[PDB]
Symmetry: C2
């Protein structure tokens, strides 16, 4: 037989699409199972492959749920707006409720990792009000007047 | 003889005496060590007739506001937009108490502030740190001055 280890991103675990495995002896493309767990080992008939999740800074895993922070300009938080957020499945636009604070959380169902029992977990988007970087000097002037 | 006591994080810091109630009705006051861990057990020798021993297990009450990472503690701090841009003093409830904290100017929601010795006691001695995660919040009723400014942009 032959034993090897492969690292796949979180998005690859969802997609199940084929991934390439390199063995010590030099030899395979394998379709990932619907339910993939970090550290899971698969016995491949006709030959042991270990699956490790590639680190994703943006995504923090809680079980099979996924959480991602969404930077949001002050204007978008007060007035609401549509902002694109990168996820496992792809880049998707998301609605920002009016008067959203940094505690706001948006729930997207079945966008998380597949569940063993079936279906998928959820992706939670944590609204985070950020300042631009270089400064505003329009907001800065407004607030000092207050 | 076995019993379990639930203490808040603030109690873990204080070491203060706590009361243990056993199945047979015997009650014992015990001085907590400076360093207390969740699930930690203290054996009081003799105290248990079944002679025997009395074992008291200390469990930490869950606290939503405080999340424990080792002996350091992290807590979210709501901060007005005005205080975030201009900096200002904002009150934060902590293990020791309600404490005012300085907000650096131009602080964003990813920013973290370090308060030393505000965490749980350390085994070696001293205390851990409290990290304060700034979160810019909007008023529950509205401003209508900031609201007008942002729509113009
Ligand atoms: Cl230090």
């Amino acid at each position: 037989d032959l034993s090897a280890s492969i690292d796949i991103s979180l998005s690859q675990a969802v997609g199940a699409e084929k991934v390439e495995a390199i063995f010590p002896n030099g030899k395979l493309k394998i379709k990932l199972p619907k339910f993939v767990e970090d550290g899971q080992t698969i016995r491949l008939k006709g030959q042991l492959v270990t699956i490790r999740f590639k680190p994703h800074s943006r995504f923090r895993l809680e079980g099979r749920d996924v959480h991602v922070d969404l930077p949001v300009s002050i204007d978008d938080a007060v007035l609401g707006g549509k902002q694109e957020v990168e996820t496992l499945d792809g880049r998707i636009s998301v609605k920002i409720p009016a008067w959203s604070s940094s505690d706001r959380v948006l729930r997207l169902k079945e966008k998380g990792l597949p569940l063993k029992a079936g279906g998928r977990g959820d992706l939670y988007v944590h609204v985070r009000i950020m300042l631009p970087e270089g400064g505003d000097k329009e907001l800065e002037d407004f607030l000092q007047k207050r």
